[PDB]
Amino acid sequence: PKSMQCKVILLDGSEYTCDVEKRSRGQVLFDKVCEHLNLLEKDYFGLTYRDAENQKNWLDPAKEIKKQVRSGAWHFSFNVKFYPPDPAQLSEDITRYYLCLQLRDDIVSGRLPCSFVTLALLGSYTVQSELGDYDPDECGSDYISEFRFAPNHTKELEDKVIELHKSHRGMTPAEAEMHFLENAKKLSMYGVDLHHAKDSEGVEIMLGVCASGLLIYRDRLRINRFAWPKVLKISYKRNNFYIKIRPGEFEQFESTIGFKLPNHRAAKRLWKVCVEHHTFFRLL
Numbered sequence: 001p002k003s004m005q006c007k008v009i010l011l012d013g014s015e016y017t018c019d020v021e022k023r024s025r026g027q028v029l030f031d032k033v034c035e036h037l038n039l040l041e042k043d044y045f046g047l048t049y050r051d052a053e054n055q056k057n058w059l060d061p062a063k064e065i066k067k068q069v070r071s072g073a074w075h076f077s078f079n080v081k082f083y084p085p086d087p088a089q090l091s092e093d094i095t096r097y098y099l100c101l102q103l104r105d106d107i108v109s110g111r112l113p114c115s116f117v118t119l120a121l122l123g124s125y126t127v128q129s130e131l132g133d134y135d136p137d138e139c140g141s142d143y144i145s146e147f148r149f150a151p152n153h154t155k156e157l158e159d160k161v162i163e164l165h166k167s168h169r170g171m172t173p174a175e176a177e178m179h180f181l182e183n184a185k186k187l188s189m190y191g192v193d194l195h196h197a198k199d200s201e202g203v204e205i206m207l208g209v210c211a212s213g214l215l216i217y218r219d220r221l222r223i224n225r226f227a228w229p230k231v232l233k234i235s236y237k238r239n240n241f242y243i244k245i246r247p248g249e250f251e252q253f254e255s256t257i258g259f260k261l262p263n264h265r266a267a268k269r270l271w272k273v274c275v276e277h278h279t280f281f282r283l284l
């Protein structure tokens with residue numbers, strides 16, 4: 001049995017190294033990572049890898065790792081794949097814990113835009129979770145938390161995190177993680193996987209995939225949303241991604257909206273994440 005060294009960036013930024021037989025399917029590595037993390041609610045999570053075009057791909061647990069990573073390194077990230085619309089219903093605190101680590105990265109990276117006040121509030125909950133109750137001994141007027149809270153840090157933001165931290169006295173890590181998630185779940189880009197595309201006129205858009213449906217971001221005005229119940233079916237062919245939308249009652253025929261993706265692999269990738277979200281959130 002020939003075994004391959006696997007490296008996995010965990011959500012705390014640490015690197016986990018393990019081995020799998022070279023012929024292993026993605027599920028084998030995923031199960032090893034989840035056992036290491038003491039994670040039982042595995043369905044929300046997955047491993048990503050970077051293809052030869054440097055695009056993020058989900059490692060398919062059903063297929064050989066080698067037939068996915070192909071010419072690239074056996075280097076992976078552990079990530080939230082399906083963001084729960086209601087994290088309060090997750091059965092385990094440890095699940096909510098990893099969801100918080102993913103969301104913190106979503107915020108710092110800028111993938112999850114956030115108001116000044118909401119950056120401070122989320123930050124205050126993270127601090128309550130990681131440090132416990134406010135202590136003025138590790139917070140002079142000039143205090144600068146080691147915690148990354150935002151894509152751009154200001155002293156005003158650092159001061160607001162501290163002021164809000166003061167109000168959370170007695171709050172346990174589990175409680176602060178729950179408060180974190182009840183706020184984060186309401187942000188407009190929460191759980192939205194964005195894909196660059198052009199519409200049929202060739203205009204640059206973004207297609208969002210999430211629990212509630214598809215979003216077409218033309219700009220900020222007339223965002224255009226298709227709830228899963230409105231979507232009749234989905235397909236790719238070559239560079240193209242097609243969405244069939246139900247007719248209104250007594251409208252006779254479904255409509256087709258077509259998009260141009262950068263390449264065929266981008267079209268398939270989008271198709272696949274749409275199918276996966278549709279199955280997951282039709283059921284959940």
Ligand SMILES: Cc1c(Cl)cccc1NC(=O)[C@@H]1CCCO1
Binds near residue numbers: 235274275279
């Ligand atoms: C996968 C899917 C999503 Cl994502 C959303 C709505 C419908 C479907 N189904 C299909 O596209 C086809 C046609 C019937 C069976 O599969």
